[PDB]
Every structure is written in structure tokens, then in C-alpha cells.
Design a protein around this ligand. Structure first.
Ligand SMILES: CC(=O)N[C@H]1[C@H]([C@H](O)[C@H](O)CO)O[C@@](O[C@H]2[C@@H](O)[C@@H](CO)O[C@@H](O[C@H]3[C@H](O)[C@@H](O)[C@@H](O)O[C@@H]3CO)[C@@H]2O)(C(=O)O)C[C@@H]1O
Lengths: 246, 200, 21, 226, 226, 21, 226, 21, 21, 21
């Protein structure tokens, strides 16, 4: 009612010569917010021998206060490719590992799994056994050394493997006929596939997972979790910054 | 007024079945009408009636019901219309929404029920395809949702993509009685796969 | 979105990433 | 024939935001196509084309009773890190950044029964003085009048007023780009009702949409919860 | 003049699937030409244009006797890692991958002597319930009728029915993309013969060709034998 | 088949591999 | 396929003036526009289109009294590191470099009251001999005459005279490119005044603008204060 | 001002620095 | 005189050396 | 004879080797 200002008048609000543009919104571009490296996870290695476990690239669980945590929670359905950096930190005296040969293998959404030592390198007694799937072949293997290695890390790009045209970050259903608990918001292969780190370290070190999700596609906006306690009435939420009264 | 859930419904036949496809004439997927519940004077805000479609209440669609019984999968939308009944002396409002893979449900999955959302949610419920039911303005919320989900069609026995929230915003303030909520679901663009055998 | 170099296409559009239909 | 090269000083350093991508190790993957509706492109769109519901003492509405006068009914420090925003979309989206910019639209939906009527002065008070405390005090400023019973819902635009080309998504001890003012709804009259024994109060929901000129910048990582 | 270069963090790592090749150390080798027939290009071709022979209790055929009724004669969990596939080409080819996709064609060749005749209901039962156990139970589903003595061989297409854009080449404890259903041949009638003292039973071979829409993806390495 | 870079031809088609008649 | 490369000997060295830039880690930042007046481009512009005020015994002017004659009134070693320049813009700007080049303009503004008048011989004496000590000594050189009471201000150009294509911004124990000469103002007559009990002296400000052919080169870092 | 290589544009004008309106 | 590569102009003629009038 | 790269001419034909008349 009445609209454009100055007259005390009922529905009549005042004028607003709305703003110009700068930045063209671009930072809030879902594809851009997601194409960078995130420190998601931290895990330890496996000994070259034993009958070890594969690890799963599932950045959909969350709960850890991390920005990329939420954001993936912001949408119902997601699709993007993957990109890694694995860094391996030291947890003892760095002079313990002279070699430090690390085997890594990537497993695509839905690959077979049981592995036991099965490859045997020998030479001058002693002789090493690497893992049955640590080996090089079909799924990409990546071997790197950490011995003065100016950056104890390795890295690469890996495609959207799932058999699902998109991934439901939420699922009002079960992924199995047996409607068991655990099988709730599940639906199998709703992730990026898996990896196996294995080495004569394993002890002496932890890892550093890092994902970069290029080509981000987000479908169906969802409620965006608060992330901070509710401040008191009629007040602000004061925080420490690059600004502030010095 | 008519509000669309993300997009008008497509009668396209499933990108993932070489298997023979029965399309459902309205006259099969007919129309269904039930009472959700009686919004009462006590139920503080944040409450809600979860209506995950269609299950729990699927036993009651007695025709549409029937074909989805003896058939493995289905793809279909939903014309749905929530109808609260109250006089002009009542106050209060709800917000009813269609939610994609809604979940919390304390695994009472696919069973309609009642809950109290966490708040950040009712605050942001509106971020989904929803409509406002304001007791001094209207008495009907009307929505239409399309098939949706990771698969190009699913098993309604394991998954319900669409689920109506009927959220309590401003408490029911006014005459002592309750205000009965109600809802008419009627399947849109229904399509089945693989007939299952005989119940023996 | 965020890929900005020239060498970003050092590898092919086909090899590098994934491809829709 | 070998190329002559000098190894730039940082050479073996990592850096987590490289504008470039890593080497592929699984090529020739063609992906299945997705119809799936509502793919959003940019976060500002849902924030603009979408109303969130405010936060006051825990509820998303404020009350009018058959007794009120000039006591301000709704008040908020215009800052994203303000209280009555805490619950909302816009506010929470902005946590993902450093600087915000523009006007915000407020939607008040009076929800008292039709037998009922009332009026309010929604006003915006510029960040100088020490905050008004009565209608007759705020009135001299930007405000409009809402007679519930003409529109049962009304929109009000909290403008962007600042030497600041951009503003602070993360406010704190009052700085010059920390606050843009104060939103206040006051009660112009009180609750008139057909029968005051049934309808004695009214609940006005208050929602917040993002401003058309609204924008966000400089993505940031999360500090310690607080 | 030296180029300015930064040594990307992985720099001296190996990676076994590099989309690029190694440096040559023996150039100028021209090779002798090869006429040699049947050079295949892609593995799906031989799998499509080629019938493999199934596996049931060790033999590649199932029997009909002069006594059978509704007892299902041939049954298989539609999964590549199913039993009656174990021996075959298609199945074994797929071990080389993670995901399969499409219909499969079955060829039943009745091989009982010409003095003989019989009929079957080949049916496909969708992966829900708990598996049928009599003809009159399966009949309500997708099936056709085979009267040996019209064609002595018949083809039946096990379709692809799943929300799954792709399926599991490596099945296991029942998942939603682990199975696509059940193939079952039943005995419609029994073995009629000129003289039942000579021909009392019949052997129907059962072969499996790859489906026209059949495809495989995501090459994988071999796990521990089992 | 699987050679996909640009530098894949850093070396000649003649030097790199073998050649049919 | 890997490129063949040789690591130039300096490879991992730093070097603080590389003609090239570092790798970006925060792209897509669009900046707000600036109207803000007086953006200068090059430092020689303000130095040319701007007068600085000289330095003599602490003040930016020299005095004439009703008693003076040939005693030189203003004298300065033409060097940037000269005394009477110390306070000024031009001089201080040049500290940022190694070599200067060109003429400099001097502005003398006689500021004695209008009841007053006087005259001076401003002269420039070439860097040979051992410096003149009386007007009649300097007169034989480049100079002009200033009768305050024709112009109350006058400009005088100290030229560039040297085998030196460039000169020394950092002077010292007398070298051939260390000095270009001597500026001297002498008193041609003395202070005539309406009433000598009120106006007995006059103050001529003396300012320095940069020469049109003036230029600077070879940016340098700061040595120990002295 | 002082950027003089060829590889100075190895990265984009958009990515590298900042941009006025 | 003795500058013979291709990359000899990796840097500009302006940046690299000195310039006469 | 056996020089087969592309970078084989990284250096000039004049600088690299020797030259006949
Ligand atoms: C995938 C696989 O087959 N793994 C098996 C490994 C690998 O074949 C082996 O590491 C290849 O390098 O080998 C295993 O069996 C070997 C083991 O029994 C040793 C111990 O004597 O002998 C190996 O064969 C010897 C043979 O005895 C010699 O005559 C000579 O030919 O050398 C070979 C090996 O150099 C067996 O292959 C193993 O021990 O791990 C079995 C794994 O399953």
C-alpha cells in the first residue's frame, strides 16, 4: 500500500536507491568454494604385512567443526570429482626411517577387497613382502619415499566413480532388504571409493588426508547449521578478528 | 494457490530399466484423503507431523495401493493438499513442507509420526518448497512434487523421497478447541516395473 | 570454477576429470 | 638440448588453494547423467530467494498484548553476528565469510486471529547515539506504519549505510564497520479484539530474506566454537 | 633466461597409471606387418557375439524327467558372482571390473532325442520377496513358454531393472545394487516319449551371451582367491 | 588407447614407439 | 615423454628483485573502485610541479639588513647532499637514489614590507677555483639582477654543467661528479625603507623546484644514519 | 610496472591479482 | 654476439639488459 | 640421424653443432 515514501502514510515505506555491484557474488559460487584443498581426516598407515583394512573416502558424515563439514550438509544431493594430497607426518625421531617406502593404492566405488601379503621382493636374505593389492596395476598405485623427501607428501586426481548418477547426502530409506539399523541413511557406494596406505613406517607416522572437490554440483538446498552458541538478548556476538579495538 | 516442488512432474519413463513399463492412469492412481492430526492448544512451537510419502499409509491407497503391491519399483509425483480447519477466532500458523530425503525420524521410518525439530530447522524449514498456513489469512497449503532421488526411480518399500512436514510456527491461540489438520495425497505420473509373483 | 592456469589443460579434458552425457 | 631451469625458492612447498589441479590417474570415466531437480549454482541465490525465520527469546515471533505503548517490542543490533539472526539461513551462510554487503528484507506476518487488529511502527535507527527507548523517540527516523488489517504481512528493507564498501560478518567490540544500526518494531496501538477473554495477544512472525544488493566475500575457516 | 619453476609437492612420486608415457631408448624400429586374422579391439564384443555355457552341479545343462511338476528346475541369483555363471566367459570377464550393466541373453538348447517333447516356463522373478517355489507362484511374473517341438532352442533376455545406473560385479551380503532378481526355468509339462524305457530324461543346455546394452567399468586388481 | 597428455608427443611418433608397414 | 631438463646452477637461490611474480593463492577477488583524487603516478612529477622551502641556519629564508655590501648572503655547494637542501622535498626524494640529473629552479620571495625595497645579484659559480668572496668577484659569472620592487619574487635556474652524463645524489670528499658548482645570492644594494626604525631588515624565502630536465636513477637502500 | 617475463601470465589476469571495477 | 638459445628472450629485451638511446 | 625430440632445437643449429661451407 502507497510504497514510495515521505507522507506518514500506512503501507508507505521510504525509498531505497539500492546498491551497485563489485565482486559479482562469485565467492558464493558453489563450484569455487569447493575446488580447493581441505584437511579432511587424519589416519595411520598399515604394515606391509598382515591382513589390513582399506579406508573410505566418505566426507558426508561430518560432525567435526570444519566448514567443509557443513556446506556438504547444505545440500541434499552432491556430485564432484576428487583430488588428494596425503602428507605423512612424523610421530617419532625422524632419523628412524632411512628408507620409508610407502605404498598407496586407490580403489574405485565398488572394488573387491581382501588383501594379505602376496608380493615378495627378495635380495640378500631379509626380503620384503608388500600387499596383495598394494601392487601396481588396474587401480592406481602411488609409491613415494620419505627420506629427506623435501615434502613428505604425494597427490593426485580421481573421478566420480559411484554407480549413482548423484550422491544422496541424506536417505529416507535403507540400502538393504534387511531393514537393519546401520542400513539407514546408507545406500552403498554413496562416496568416492577407498585407499590403502602401507609401509615400513606405519608406526613412526600418521597421515593427513586432504580432498579438493572440483566440478562441484549441489542439488536441493537444505538448512545450514548455526555453528556458534545463541548469543544473549538484544546483544551481538563479539568475536576476535583482524579488526577490533587494539 | 499452486506451489511446485523444484519442478513440474515429468512423465518420462526410467533411464534404468530395459524391463517392461506399466504407466498408471489417474483412474488407477486415484485420490486419497485422510486426517493428519488435531493441532492442539498445548503443543509449543517446533512440533510437527511427519508424513513421509507414502508408506505407513500405503496400505490405505486401496487401488493405487494395489498395483504398487505387486510391482517392484515406482516413479511418481504427488499432488498433496494440507487442510487445517479453524474459525476466525483462532490464531497461529504452521508451515507445511515437502522435504527431499527428510530424515531424523528416530528410524520410525516411513511411518508418519510427531516430533519437535531442533530449531535451526524450523527456522530454516522454509528453505525447502513450503507454503504458509496463517490462521488470519488462509486455510490451505497446496503443493505438487515431482519424482526425485539418487535413482531414476526407487522402491517405495525402502525409500520414500518425498515427505511432508507440517510444522507449528505460532501456537494455536484462541477458542478452547483443537484445529484438525488434513491431507489429500494423490499420485501424479505413476509408473511401475517388475511384477512380483503370487502371495502363496 | 577455480581452475585458472594455462597448464590446467596440460592433460586432456577427457583424461583429467569425468564426463557427463 | 635440455631446457635451462631455475628452481623457484618455494619449489617443494604445498599451499592448499593452488589455482591449479593435480595429475589424473584414472582417465576415461564417463559418468551417468542426472535429471535431478533444483541444482543450485551460487549460495546467494537461495539466500535471496528465501526467507529464514528470526530468533527472539527462542521463538521466531514477537508478541503484542492488550497493553504496550512505547516500550520497544523488537530490537536488534544490525550486525550479522546479532542475536535475532542466530537461528537463520542468511546469518549462518555468512559465517562462511568475512564481509557482507547490502540491505536485508524483513517479513512480519501478523498471525493473530481475524477478530483481532493492531498497528506497529517498524523503524531503523542509525548507529550513533545510545539507542532510543520509546516510539516518540524513534519516530524521527526511517520507519513506516503497519496497520495489521490492511496487509496481514509486511516487508521492511534494512538498508546499507556505510563509508564501508563492505561490512563485518564477524562483529565484535564496537568498530566503524561492525554495526550498520538497529532494527526496532514498536507497538503503534495495542490489541483490539472482538472478545478480549479469547484473544488477548498476537504473534507476528518475523522472517529475513537476503537483500538484492546483498553479497558476501573472502571465504574463511572456522575458529573455536563460542 | 632460466625458466622459473616450482616443484609440485608430489614431484618424485611414482603412480602406476600415469596417462603419459616414458622416455624411448631404442628408436627407429620398424616392425614387420601382420595379416593374422581375428584381432579383437574391445572385450565386450566377444562377450556379446559369443555364447558361454552355464554351470549347474558341475554340468552345463539341466534335466527334465518323466516326473517333475512345479519344483523349479533351474534357479540363479541374478548377480555376476552367481553360481551358474561361475564357469562362463561373461562372468569371468567381469571379474576384471567393478560394475556391470544391462540385460543378458540365455540360450536353452533342448537336446533330448526327436522321439521326445516337453515344455517349460522360463521366468524372471524381481528381487523383493523371498523367492517363489512353484510354477503357479512364478507365473504371475515375466515369463514365456517354451514348447520344445516348435523350436528345439530358445533365447530369453534377463533385463536390467534398477535404480542403480550400474550394478555390482562383485556381489556379497545382499545390498540394493547387489542383485537384480532371479532366473528360473520350471517344467511346464514332463517328458513325453515314444518309448519311455529308452528316453526317460532330457538335457537342455543353457548358454549365456552378453546383453546388447551390456557394459563394464572400473578395472580392478585381484583380491585373495576365494 | 590411454596416452593422454600433450607432451605425449614430446618425442616423435618415429622415435618413441614401433612402426608397422 | 618427460621433458629433458638441466637445473641451472643458481636453482634454489632467492634474489629480491626478480622481474617476475609469485604464485596466487586467493584468486577471484574483485576490488571496490576508487574515485579518490590526486593519485600520482611518478615521483618526479610532484618534485617538478612543487616547490620545497630551503634550509639556512634552521629557517627557510635569508636576511638583508640596512648594512651589507659584497659579503655573500646565500651560498651552497651545488650537490644534493648540500646543506640548504637538507630540509626540502627534492633533496629527500633523491636519497632514494644514486644519480640525479638536470637544472633546479630557485624561487626567492622577498617578503619585506611594501614600504621597503632592495636588490640582489643571484649568481652561479662553476666548480673550479676556491669560491668567490665578494660581489665584484662573482659578477664576472652567470647571474641576473633582482630589483625587489619590479617582482617581489623571482625564479633562478641552477643549470646542469658536466662531462657527467649523470650526477651524484650521494656526494662526499670532492670528486668530478660530486659537485656541479655554487649558488650565491649577494646583496646588490641594501634595505631602503620609509622608516628604518620599523623596517630595518627583510626576509627572502627561497624555494626549490625540480628542473624540467631533472631525472633520477638507480634506487638504493639506506645506509647507517649520519 | 616491474612485471617482465612472459611466464608472468602463467596464471590468469583474473586469478593472479585483484580486479577493479 | 654469443646469446643463442630460444629461451634467451625468456625475459624481455627491456628487463634483461640495458638500453641505448 | 638419431636426433629426435622437438626440444632437440632448443639450441640453435648454429650454436649447438658445427657448420660446413
Ligand atoms: C600373487 C602370487 O602368486 N603371490 C605368491 C607369491 C608370488 O608368486 C611371489 O612373491 C612372486 O615374486 O609367492 C608365494 O610363493 C612363493 C614362495 O613359496 C617362495 C618360497 O620358496 O617360493 C616361490 O617360488 C620360488 C621357487 O621356489 C624357485 O624355484 C624360483 O623359481 O624362484 C621362485 C620365486 O622367486 C613361490 O612362488 C609367496 O611365498 O608369497 C605365494 C604367493 O601367494
Amino acid at each position: 500500500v502507497t510504497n514510495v515514501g515521505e507522507d506518514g502514510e500506512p503501507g508507505e515505506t521510504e525509498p531505497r536507491h539500492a546498491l551497485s555491484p563489485v565482486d559479482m557474488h562469485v565467492h558464493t559460487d558453489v563450484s569455487f568454494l569447493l575446488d580447493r584443498f581441505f584437511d579432511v581426516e587424519t589416519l595411520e598407515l598399515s604394515n606391509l604385512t598382515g591382513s589390513p583394512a582399506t579406508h573410505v573416502l566418505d566426507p558426508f558424515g561430518s560432525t567435526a567443526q570444519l566448514a567443509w563439514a557443513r556446506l556438504l550438509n547444505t545440500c541434499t544431493y552432491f556430485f564432484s570429482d576428487l583430488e588428494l594430497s596425503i602428507q605423512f607426518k612424523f610421530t617419532t625421531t625422524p632419523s628412524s626411517v632411512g628408507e620409508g617406502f610407502v605404498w598407496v593404492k586407490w580403489f574405485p566405488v565398488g572394488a573387491p577387497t581382501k588383501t594379505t601379503d602376496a608380493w615378495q621382493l627378495e635380495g640378500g636374505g631379509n626380503s620384503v613382502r608388500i600387499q596383495q593389492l598394494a601392487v601396481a596395476g588396474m587401480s592406481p598405485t602411488v609409491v613415494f619415499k620419505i627420506a629427506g623427501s623435501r615434502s613428505q607428501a604425494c597427490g593426485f586426481s580421481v573421478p566420480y566413480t559411484s554407480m549413482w548418477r548423484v550422491v544422496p547426502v541424506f536417505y529416507n530409506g535403507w540400502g538393504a532388504p534387511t531393514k537393519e539399523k546401520a542400513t539407514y541413511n546408507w545406500l552403498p557406494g554413496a562416496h568416492f571409493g577407498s585407499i590403502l596406505l602401507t609401509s615400513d613406517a606405519h608406526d613412526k607416522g600418521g597421515c593427513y588426508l586432504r580432498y579438493r572437490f572440483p566440478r562441484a554440483n549441489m542439488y536441493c538446498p537444505r538448512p545450514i547449521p548455526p555453528a556458534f552458541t545463541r548469543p544473549a538478548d538484544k546483544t551481538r556476538h563479539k568475536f576476535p578478528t583482524n579488526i577490533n579495538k587494539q | 494457490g499452486t506451489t511446485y516442488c523444484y519442478s513440474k512432474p515429468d512423465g518420462r519413463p526410467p533411464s534404468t530399466v530395459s524391463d517392461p513399463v506399466t504407466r498408471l492412469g489417474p483412474t488407477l492412481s486415484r485420490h486419497y484423503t485422510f486426517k493428519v492430526g488435531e493441532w492442539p492448544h498445548s503443543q509449543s512451537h517446533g512440533h510437527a507431523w511427519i508424513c513421509p510419502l507414502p508408506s505407513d499409509k500405503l496400505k490405505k491407497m486401496g487401488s493405487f495401493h494395489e498395483v504398487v503391491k505387486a510391482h517392484h519399483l515406482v516413479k511418481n509425483g504427488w499432488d498433496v493438499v494440507v487442510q487445517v480447519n479453524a474459525s476466525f477466532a483462532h490464531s497461529g500458523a504452521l508451515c507445511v513442507a515437502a522435504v527431499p530425503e527428510y530424515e531424523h525420524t528416530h528410524e520410525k521410518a516411513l511411518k508418519w509420526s510427531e516430533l519437535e525439530e531442533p530449531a535451526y530447522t524450523y527456522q530454516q524449514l522454509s528453505v525447502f518448497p513450503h507454503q504458509l498456513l496463517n490462521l488470519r489469512t488462509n486455510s490451505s497449503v497446496h503443493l505438487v512434487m515431482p519424482y526425485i532421488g539418487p535413482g531414476p526411480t526407487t522402491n517405495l518399500t525402502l525409500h520414500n523421497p518425498w515427505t511432508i512436514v507440517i510444522l507449528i510456527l505460532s501456537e494455536l491461540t484462541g477458542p478452547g478447541q483443537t484445529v484438525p489438520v488434513t491431507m489429500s495425497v494423490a499420485p501424479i505420473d505413476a509408473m511401475v516395473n517388475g511384477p512380483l509373483p503370487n502371495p502363496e | 570454477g577455480n581452475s585458472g592456469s594455462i597448464v590446467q589443460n596440460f592433460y586432456m579434458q577427457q583424461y583429467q576429470n569425468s564426463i557427463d552425457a | 638440448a635440455p631446457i635451462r631451469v631455475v628452481s623457484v625458492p618455494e619449489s617443494d612447498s604445498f599451499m592448499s588453494s593452488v589455482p591449479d589441479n593435480s595429475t589424473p590417474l584414472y582417465p576415461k570415466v564417463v559418468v551417468p547423467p542426472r535429471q535431478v531437480p533444483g541444482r543450485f549454482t551460487n549460495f546467494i541465490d537461495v539466500a535471496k530467494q528465501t526467507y529464514s525465520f528470526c530468533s527472539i527469546s527462542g521463538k521466531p515471533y514477537f508478541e503484542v498484548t492488550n497493553t504496550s505503548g512505547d516500550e520497544p517490542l523488537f530490537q536488534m543490533d544490525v550486525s550479522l553476528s546479532a542475536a535475532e539472526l542466530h537461528g537463520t539461513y542468511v546469518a549462518s551462510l555468512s559465517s562462511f565469510f568475512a564481509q557482507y554487503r547490502g540491505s536485508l528484507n524483513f517479513y512480519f506476518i501478523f498471525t493473530g486471529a481475524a477478530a483481532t487488529k493492531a498497528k506497529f511502527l517498524v523503524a531503523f535507527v542509525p548507529p550513533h547515539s545510545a539507542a532510543p527507548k520509546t516510539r516518540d523517540e524513534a519516530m524521527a527516523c526511517i520507519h513506516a506504519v503497519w496497520d495489521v488489517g490492511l496487509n496481514s504481512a509486511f516487508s521492511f528493507n534494512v538498508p546499507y549505510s556505510s563509508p564501508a564498501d563492505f561490512m563485518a560478518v564477524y562483529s565484535a567490540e564496537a568498530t566503524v564497520v561492525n554495526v550498520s544500526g538497529w532494527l526496532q518494531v514498536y507497538a503503534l496501538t495495542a490489541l483490539t479484539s472482538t472478545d478480549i477473554a479469547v484473544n488477548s495477544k498476537g504473534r507476528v512472525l518475523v522472517a529475513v530474506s537476503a537483500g538484492p544488493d546483498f553479497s558476501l566475500r573472502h571465504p574463511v575457516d572456522l575458529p573455536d566454537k563460542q
